Swiss-Prot record, chain A:
This is Kelch repeat and BTB domain-containing protein 2. Pathway: Protein modification; protein ubiquitination. Kelch repeats lie at residues 311-361, 362-410, 412-450, 451-492, 498-544. It comes from the Eukaryota. GO terms for cellular component: Cul3-RING ubiquitin ligase complex; cytoplasm. Residues 127-223 form the BACK domain. The gene is KBTBD2. The lineage of its organism: Eukaryota, Metazoa, Chordata, Craniata, Vertebrata. Recognizes the BCR (BTB-CUL3-RBX1) E3 ubiquitin ligase complex substrate, PIK3R1, through the 4 tandem C-terminal Kelch domains. PROSITE patterns: BTB. Keywords: Kelch repeat, Phosphoprotein, Repeat, Ubl conjugation pathway.
Swiss-Prot record, chain B:
It comes from Homo sapiens (Human). This is Cullin-3. It is linked to Pseudohypoaldosteronism 2E: An autosomal dominant disorder characterized by severe hypertension, hyperkalemia, hyperchloremia, hyperchloremic metabolic acidosis, and correction of physiologic abnormalities by thiazide diuretics. Neurodevelopmental disorder with or without autism or seizures: An autosomal dominant disorder manifesting in infancy and characterized by global developmental delay, variably impaired intellectual development, and speech delay. Some patients have seizures, others have autistic features or behavioral abnormalities. Additional variable features include cardiac defects, failure to thrive, or brain imaging anomalies. Brain, spermatozoa, and testis (at protein level). Widely expressed. Belongs to the cullin family. Neddylated. Attachment of NEDD8 is required for the E3 ubiquitin-protein ligase activity of the BCR complex. Deneddylated via its interaction with the COP9 signalosome (CSN) complex. High-glucose conditions in renal tubular epithelial cells lead to up-regulation of CUL3 expression, significant increase in CUL3-mediated ubiquitination of MRPL12 and dysregulation of mitochondrial biosynthesis. The gene is CUL3.
């Protein structure tokens, strides 16, 4: 039995003290002239290479001084101090060299720690770099994660400097995969070309291999003429092998072309009584209802946000204590292919129904019951999508509840009962805006074009605001049946303003129908009526947002018409 | 890098391995070999290293132990076999250390047996399961066990060492050892006990 109370801590601390005082040391590591006196026992128990270094009978087993090369001094020092105290304390810059030295020394625990740290830090730019790093040092988890991140982002960037310097096998795996998040088939062609234009006459065979990989759909466009311009002289059989890649090799449709603009819904009426809420989706064009997996599977009252790059995030929320609703500041992100939710850096305050707004690539969470007992109750907190951290900003002018916030013209706009403030990201300050003549709450707003459409409130209040004009005006009243309480939802659909409303009467069933609204007509034309045979009841606290999803990755929601 | 550099690295590694297998592991460095293995597997040339290791091991076995066992099939045959097995194990200790540093990545990527298992398999194929060594070992073990059963006492720890060697050579369980030992031994025991019962009745 390992008694952790007395001996373990005391033994570890005394070993650390002996290391500090250079006591009972019998082996010293020479690293480019730097001396690291240490013990053989700790190296054997920590590293799987030092055990063979000191146990296997050779000339270095009986050697007081050992000249270990191809290792950095700082990395070896941090590995030794981790072995002597158990704390790694890794930064964000020296992770690559630390992992390389750990792999060379075969220290499993620090290898796993660095693997987890790297798999948690594939943010935006090191994806291709760490993918190449994992290709150099075999790491299945890192390889798969970096491959997915590359298939997600490089398909939208395809210009990274590090991407040019890649091995043939990794590039073939990337290109031949059917996970390319590209809505068009020419971008991958030009990416492959530019990968084969900066290094030509050196990778001509690999040029032919990538040419075959990109396949006929993009092979029949321009590649022949560009290659004729760039081919080496006196090349004949290369023409023969290039001409062959027209008929064969199974031309098939890709997966990234299925970016159907749909609607993501949360907190729906769960089918099985064992579950409370569920997240589902609706297809405006396919006229189908898809489902999504709950991010925590137990926590509710979350807020949604969609970046211009079509990303889904979940922040805040409350979960039942399950003693024998507590608020959690956790964060999550939705995978567009794996149909799962990978968590991210949690917030600093446990918010209830936060309002997340994206602007300038940053996620801004406005209000939502931060802690409630703040000295300055009207505060906010934003997110960094690149650095993966939360930065405090200028707080709210006035404290508001059940508010809504949108982004227009790269500016933060938050709407409340009657007031509105514009937050300047450049100066980090709030400027007073126009005041609504009607006091309505429990409503949301949509940022369509350059006009904010605040719909609903307690109703059918249609108050249109323009940034360039800075005024509030009414347009019309949405046609709804009397003796009902409509639930309005305003969102952009296919670059056209539309609404999604549900009417409920006494002893009557709910009806779902979306209307097409015109700017100059001030009328909601009947666009499409959602049939109850495909979509069932949603509820009251459901939310709506616009985003593109994959039908194959998701699954249809089974429900009897 | 260039093929010349990796060829020279492999040549020196093979020379070091042969020197180790020749009971001369005292004056040989370990850090240099580990660094060369690192720079060899790093450049994604593990297949060549594995093939060269297999070729070197099988050539060394066929040259040394196959000749030694056949040259002493009557003068301490089992003792020489046990000594050869012990020498092979004590060299494969360090061989497996280095090529197991290699094996981590190699068999977590290429899905093959480890170098210790490779050495065990090649030893089984080239020594124990030889066309002449196998039958001679079977005959001598049957003869000595029958003589022990007759009433006179012979060496017993040696048979335990041989059985343990065969069990380790199984490398998965009791697949090879059980057949190779028991089946001729089962038949010999069957005939012996049948004759004994016929005499006793």
């Amino acid at each position: 039995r390992q008694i952790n109370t007395e001996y373990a801590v005391s033994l570890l601390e005394q070993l650390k003290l002996f290391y500090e005082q250079q006591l009972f040391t019998d082996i010293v590591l020479i690293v480019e002239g730097t001396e690291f006196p240490c013990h053989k026992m700790v190296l054997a128990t920590c590293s799987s290479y030092f055990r063979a270094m000191f146990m296997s009978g050779l000339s270095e087993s009986k050697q007081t001084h050992v000249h270990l090369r191809n290792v950095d001094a700082a990395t070896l020092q941090i590995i030794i101090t981790y072995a002597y105290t158990g704390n790694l304390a890794m930064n964000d810059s020296t992770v690559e060299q630390l992992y390389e030295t750990a792999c060379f020394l075969q220290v499993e625990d620090v290898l796993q720690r660095c693997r987890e740290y790297l798999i948690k830090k594939i943010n935006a730019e090191n994806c291709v770099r760490l993918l190449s790093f994992a290709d150099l040092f075999s790491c299945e988890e890192l390889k798969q994660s970096a491959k997915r991140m590359v298939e997600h982002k490089f398909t939208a960037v395809y210009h990274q400097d590090a991407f040019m310097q890649l091995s043939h096998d990794l590039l073939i795996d990337i290109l031949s995969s059917d996970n390319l998040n590209v809505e068009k088939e020419e971008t991958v062609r030009e990416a492959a070309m530019l990968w084969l234009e900066y290094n030509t006459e050196s990778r001509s065979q690999y040029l032919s291999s990538v040419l075959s990989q990109i396949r006929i759909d993009a092979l029949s466009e321009v590649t022949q003429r560009a290659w004729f311009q760039g081919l080496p002289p006196n090349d004949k059989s290369v023409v023969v092998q290039g001409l062959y890649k027209s008929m064969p090799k199974f031309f098939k449709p890709r997966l990234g072309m299925t970016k159907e603009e749909m609607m993501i819904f949360i907190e729906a009426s769960s089918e099985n009584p064992c579950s409370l809420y569920s997240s589902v989706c609706y297809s405006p064009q396919a006229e189908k209802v898809y489902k999504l997996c709950s991010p925590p599977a137990d926590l509710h009252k979350v807020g949604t946000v969609v970046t211009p790059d079509n990303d889904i995030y979940i922040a805040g929320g409350q979960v039942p204590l399950k003693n024998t609703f507590r608020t959690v500041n956790c964060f999550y992100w939705f995978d567009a292919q794996q149909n799962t939710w990978f968590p991210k850096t949690p917030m600093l305050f446990v918010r209830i129904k936060p309002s997340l707004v994206c602007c300038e690539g940053y996620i801004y969470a406005i209000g939502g019951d931060s802690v409630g007992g703040e000295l300055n109750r009207r505060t906010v907190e934003r997110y960094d999508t690149e650095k993966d951290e939360w930065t405090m900003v200028s707080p709210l002018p006035c404290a508001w509840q059940w508010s809504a916030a949108v982004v227009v013209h790269d500016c933060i706009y938050v709407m409340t009962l009657n007031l509105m403030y514009c937050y300047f990201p450049r100066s980090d300050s709030w400027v007073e805006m126009a005041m609504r003549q009607t006091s309505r709450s429990f409503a949301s707003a949509a940022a369509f074009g350059d006009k904010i459409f605040y719909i609903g409130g307690l109703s059918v209040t249609v108050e249109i605001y323009d940034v360039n004009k800075n005024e509030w005006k009414m347009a019309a009243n949405i046609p709804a049946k009397r003796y009902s309480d409509p639930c309005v939802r305003a969102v952009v659909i296919s670059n056209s303003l539309c609404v999604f409303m549900r009417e409920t009467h006494l002893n009557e069933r709910a009806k779902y129908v979306t209307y097409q609204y015109d700017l100059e007509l001030d009328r909601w034309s009947l666009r499409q009526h959602i049939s109850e045979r495909v979509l069932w009841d949603l509820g009251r606290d459901f939310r709506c947002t616009v985003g593109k999803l994959y039908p194959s990755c998701l699954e249809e929601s089974p429900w009897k018409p | 890098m260039d093929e010349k550099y990796v060829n020279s690295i492999w040549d020196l590694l093979k020379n070091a391995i042969q020197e180790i297998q020749r009971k001369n592991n005292s004056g040989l460095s370990f850090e240099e070999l580990y660094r060369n293995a690192y720079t060899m597997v790093l450049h994604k040339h593990g297949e060549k290293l594995y093939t060269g290791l297999r070729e070197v091991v099988t050539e060394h076995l066929i040259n040394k132990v196959r000749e030694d066992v056949l040259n002493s099939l009557n003068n301490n045959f089992l003792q020489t076999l046990n000594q050869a097995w012990n020498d092979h194990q004590t060299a494969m200790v360090m061989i497996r250390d280095i090529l197991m540093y290699m094996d981590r990545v190699y068999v977590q990527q290429n899905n093959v047996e480890n170098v210790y298992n490779l050495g065990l398999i090649i030893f089984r194929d080239q020594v124990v399961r030889y066309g002449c060594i196998r039958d001679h070992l079977r005959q001598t073990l049957l003869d000595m066990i029958a003589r022990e059963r007759k009433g006179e006492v012979v060496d017993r720890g040696a048979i335990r060492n041989a059985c343990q060697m065969l069990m380790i050579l199984g490398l998965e369980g009791r697949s090879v050892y059980e057949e190779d030992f028991e089946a001729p031994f089962l038949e010999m025991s069957a005939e012996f006990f049948q004759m004994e019962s016929q005499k006793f009745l």
